[PDB]
Amino acid sequence: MRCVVFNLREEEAPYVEKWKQSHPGVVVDTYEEPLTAKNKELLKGYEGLVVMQFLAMEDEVYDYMGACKLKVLSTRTAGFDMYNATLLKKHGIRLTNVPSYSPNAIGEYALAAALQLTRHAREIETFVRKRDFRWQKPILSKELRCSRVGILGTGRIGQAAARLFKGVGAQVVGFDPYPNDAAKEWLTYVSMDELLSTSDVISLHMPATKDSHHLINAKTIAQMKDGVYLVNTARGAVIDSQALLDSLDKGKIAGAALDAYEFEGPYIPKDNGNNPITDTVYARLVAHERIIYTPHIAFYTETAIENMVFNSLDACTTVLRGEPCAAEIKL
Amino acid sequence: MRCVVFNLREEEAPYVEKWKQSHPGVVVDTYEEPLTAKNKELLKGYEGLVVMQFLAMEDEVYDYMGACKLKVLSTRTAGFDMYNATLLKKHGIRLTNVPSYSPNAIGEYALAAALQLTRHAREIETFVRKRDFRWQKPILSKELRCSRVGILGTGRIGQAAARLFKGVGAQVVGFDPYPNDAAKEWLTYVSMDELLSTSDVISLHMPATKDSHHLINAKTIAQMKDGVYLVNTARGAVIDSQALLDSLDKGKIAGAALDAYEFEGPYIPKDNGNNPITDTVYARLVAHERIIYTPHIAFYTETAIENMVFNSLDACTTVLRGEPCAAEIKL
Ligand SMILES: [Cl-]
Ligand SMILES: [Cl-]
């Protein structure tokens, strides 16, 4: 029952210690550094590997996992395509993930960002910095209780967002290819056309599929209300980014909050102070005056960290004991 | 029954027209400009005067109201100390105000500002500006559903805030000298000491009485949790401003959102681009990196404007009909 954790961030460390305290007899050694060809020897003697690493591990790292007879690689994230499933399977190494951390974290961020937009936070700041303290129409707001909010995607996260928008008084409508009864507690299902053409705020909550790809594009943006506000806490591929930029530049969309960009991979979650953004679309997005751009932090709350740590260690050790694990990805 | 409206702003005009459409036969003439000694003759023939004026009227204006036999001055605001009640009473002119516009507007702003603080909006934007897109502890957030929010003052506005905070999952506690049962739908009443010492976010909603003056001061701040967030949508006098600045500088209070400042009167709601803020406390406060300063706009929503217009015209005309008016200020 020997486990090693890499990529350990400072906020994760106390949760690892809490988990260890509640699970005596499990060895859990930790490293802040990533696992690479250069330090692969640190794997020796462990049966479980717990990681949160977007940087690719060289093939020789996986081969060394095989030579060490590693039994399971457990990621702390929902995504797992950043790991080499081919080599895991070849060496008989199992794989687990963490499918959900905190739906409420992401719904709460969607509400927070929506309120930054509808309450004109950035425009007020611009005026305040110039000492223009007037009560003037450009900063006059519409209350969410007088607004319609459209939720695109009604899985657990979309439902959390819908619940929160209804909780502040908004009329919430939803669209999903597979409507469910639970979401009807917080929203009314409508057609795509109705959601697009009548919503004051649109918040995206769809997973990555062939059918969510570029759902928000020049054609669907053209159907929206003039002055709509758009929030994206889903993956970036749901938006055709240039179409969004064009619509912001023309004033069709009054503002957007983007926590994701379709091609953010080279840059998230890294310090790029000395790493120029060479994707000119992304460089425009991140700097746009009408976009509240955030680096994929909708999830980034204490509750999410706790669940990422506890659930990954639980999954890892469940597999090590040869027990069924609902978070196991069969290869 | 003739009424004249001064100080008419762009956003108010459609509501005046809507009110006129449902009160055919009442003359309601409008002016965008203020009423002053230079245009006092515009008062001839009017019985009701409806105002929202930021500039003192000279004594001779009030004397001219008396000569014209004006019956009532009706403000569109809750405050009325900006008008010369001494001369209104001398000339037998009655006074009405608008005690409430949209409690939800102000509660919604308190929630919006709280979420800017708890979700680290400004700190994230500062990292984004530097292209630092790391998931780093300074921008890790605590969800409101895992937080205690303390509501100081449980009138209509505090109740609206409490309802909205509960609506996003927070555990809401309240303190008031006179607890009421309506507020108990949304919060639990606790002692002042308990509210101060256990709240993650404190939102102020108390009227400006001797008892609430500098309620937030060096002593009560010292009772708070390290890293508390503070929101003030109430009047500025409930906070000892220098004590707040000191505690922000020392890191005791992690951040504050202030929609008001005790000595803001010379500057609100004016364009001060050509008017220095000579009050050095206010100048520091508006510029402080840990303060989200806004120019008294928590109320500033479409619904509030509609209610300011409708309620002032209703009060004015109720008085002119010789009927009792709950919004009349007896001088
Ligand atoms: Cl509104
Ligand atoms: Cl949390």
SS (H, E, C) A174-205: EECCCCCCHHHHCCEECCHHHHHHHCCEEEEC
Cis peptide before A269 (omega within 30 of 0): yes
Instruction: Give CA–CA dist A235/B12, Å, rounded.
Output: 41
Q: Verify whether the Cβ–Cβ distance B168 to A164 is below 8 Å.
A: yes
Residue A321: strand, helix, or coil: coil
Cis peptide before B269 (omega within 30 of 0): yes
| One domain, residues B144 and B224 | yes
| One domain, residues A119 and A227 | yes
Tokens of A99: 């499918």
Tokens of A108: 């709460």
Q: Is B283 on the interface with A (CB under 8 A)?
A: no
Burial of A272 (0-12, 13-18, 19+ CB in 10 A): middle
Contact present, A300 and B139 (Cβ < 8 Å): yes
Tokens of B261: 């400042």
| One domain, residues A260 and A309 | no
β partners of residue B301: A141
| One domain, residues B288 and B143 | yes
| One domain, residues B95 and B113 | no
Q: What is the DSSP letter of A254?
A: E
Q: Verify whether the Cβ–Cβ distance B270 to A134 is below 8 Å.
A: yes
Instruction: Give CA–CA dist B111/A233, Å, rounded.
Output: 20
Phi, psi of A328 (to 5 degrees): -75, 135
Active-site entry in B94, B264, B290, B306: B264
| One domain, residues B138 and B170 | yes
Burial of B170 (0-12, 13-18, 19+ CB in 10 A): buried
β partners of residue A253: A228
Instruction: Give CA–CA dist B259/B295, Å, rounded.
Output: 6
Sign of the dihedral defined by the CA atoms of residues A298, A303, A305, A308, in that order: negative
Range of the domain at B228: 103-298
Q: Which of residues 148-167 of A touch B (CB under 8 A)?
A: 164, 166-167
C-alpha distances (whole Å) from B133 to each of A35, B58, B142, B266 are 21, 57, 19, 41
| One domain, residues B306 and B288 | no
HSE (CB half, 13 Å, CA atoms) of A232?
27
B42 contact partners, CB below 8 Å, separation of at least 6: B4, B31, B35
A77 contact partners, CB below 8 Å, separation of at least 6: A52, A97, A98, A308
H/E element, A285? helix A280-287
β partners of residue B216: B239
Instruction: Give CA–CA dist B74/B80, Å, rounded.
Output: 9
Closest Cα to residue B236, out of B253, B212, B270? B212
Q: What is the DSSP letter of B77?
A: S
Tokens of A331: 């290869």
Looking at all shown ligands, the one closest to residue A170's CA atom is 1
| One domain, residues B118 and B237 | yes
| One domain, residues B264 and B184 | yes
Q: B171-175 and B148-152: which strand pairing? A: parallel
Q: From the centroid of its chain, how far is CA A86?
A: 25
A218 contact partners, CB below 8 Å, separation of at least 6: A240, A243, A246, A247
Q: What is the DSSP letter of B37?
A: G
Tokens of B72: 């009532």
Produce one character per residue of A241-265: b if its CB has 16 or more CB atoms within 10 Å, e if not. Answer: bebbbebbeeebbbbbbbbbbbebe
CA distance B106 to chain A (A): 10
Tokens of B153: 């003052």
Resolution in A: 1.4
Tell me chain B's radius of gyration from C-alpha atoms: 22
Instruction: Give CA–CA dist A89/A65, Å, rounded.
Output: 11
Q: Which residue stretches of A71-136 are H helix?
A: 85-90, 103-118, 121-129
β partners of residue A327: none
Instruction: Give CA–CA dist A63/A58, Å, rounded.
Output: 9
Q: Is B209 annotated as a binding residue?
A: no
Residue A159: strand, helix, or coil: helix
| One domain, residues B96 and B218 | no
As for how many domains chain B has, the answer is 2
Looking at all shown ligands, the one closest to residue A144's CA atom is 1
C-alpha distances (whole Å) from A45 to each of A1, A19, A40, A74, A91 are 10, 21, 12, 16, 16
Contact present, A110 and A117 (Cβ < 8 Å): no
H/E element, A148? strand A148-152
Q: Which residue type is seen at B162?
A: A
Q: Is A177 annotated as a binding residue?
A: no
CA distance B62 to chain A (A): 26
Residue A149: strand, helix, or coil: strand
Q: Verify whether the Cβ–Cβ distance A108 to B130 is below 8 Å.
A: no
Q: Locate tokens 């895991």: which residue?
A: A88
| One domain, residues B4 and B136 | no
Query: What is the residue-wise DSSP string for B90-153?
Result: HTT-EEE----S-HHHHHHHHHHHHHHHHTTHHHHHHHHHTTB----GGG-B--GGGSEEEEE-
Q: Verify whether the Cβ–Cβ distance A116 to B116 is below 8 Å.
A: yes
| One domain, residues A33 and A112 | no
Q: Is A235 annotated as a binding residue?
A: yes
HSE (CB half, 13 Å, CA atoms) of A128?
24
